């Protein structure tokens, strides 16, 4: 979900600005984030319209 | 007008897209500052050893 | 009101972003650098 | 090979205990060299971490 992903990505940033992680965790967290960012943007531009009558 | 009706009901795709882009700029910039701090800390401890 | 540190930086950011806006400035490039991600950092 | 925390924590002891001057200049070399080897492993971890970042973002 876009809003869940946006909110979840928001928490990735917050930890990185607390500055308490080990290197491996930071890099692991970073790859969690940027990967989640592309997936979110692609899904936004991929959907299309649906309509039905009666 | 009927066009305005669709404007008050629907979201704004371009604004969300500007939202996901901006949060990525913050995420990318955060790592640059995070690495530089750790790199300089190691650099000084290495200088002391020399 | 008593500001917490986080709220203070929030209101300060909103102030400048809302008053000065976008301006044209001139100066000399100093202390250039370009980390891995590709962003440019430098001092005027 | 070690975590970055071990790298700097260990190097902290060597400089701190070596800087004290509590040994002859010719005896501490059993450790002063040990400082260099710790530095190499620490740097190796850090530099490759920077490359690991660029591959993730350099995909476009």
What does this protein structure show overall?
- This is part of a larger assembly, with two copies of chain A and two copies of chain B.
- Helix content of chain A is 72%, strand content 0%.
- Chain A is an all-alpha fold and 54 residues long.
- The longest helix of chain A is centred in the middle third of the chain and has 24 residues, at 23-46.
- Chain A starts with a helix and ends in an 8-residue tail after the last helix.
- Chains in contact: A-B, A-D, B-C, B-D, C-D.
- Chain A binds chain B through residues 2, 6, 9-10, 12-13, 16-17, 19, 23, 26, 30, 33-34, 37, 40-41, 44-45, and chain B through 13, 16-17, 19-21, 23-24, 26-28, 30-31, 34, 37-38.
- The PDB classes it as dna binding protein.
- The entry lists the keywords Exonuclease, Endonuclease, DNA repair, DNA binding protein.
- E. coli ExoVII(H238A).
- Chains A, D are Exodeoxyribonuclease 7 small subunit.
Task: Summarize the helices and strands and which ones pair or pack.
This is part of a larger assembly, with 2 copies of chain A and 2 copies of chain B.
Chain A: H1 2-16, H2 23-46
Helix pairs in contact in A: 1-2
Chain B: H1 2-9, H2 13-49
Enzyme class (chain A): hydrolase
EC number (chain A): 3.1.11.6
Keywords (chain A): Cytoplasm, Exonuclease, Hydrolase, Nuclease
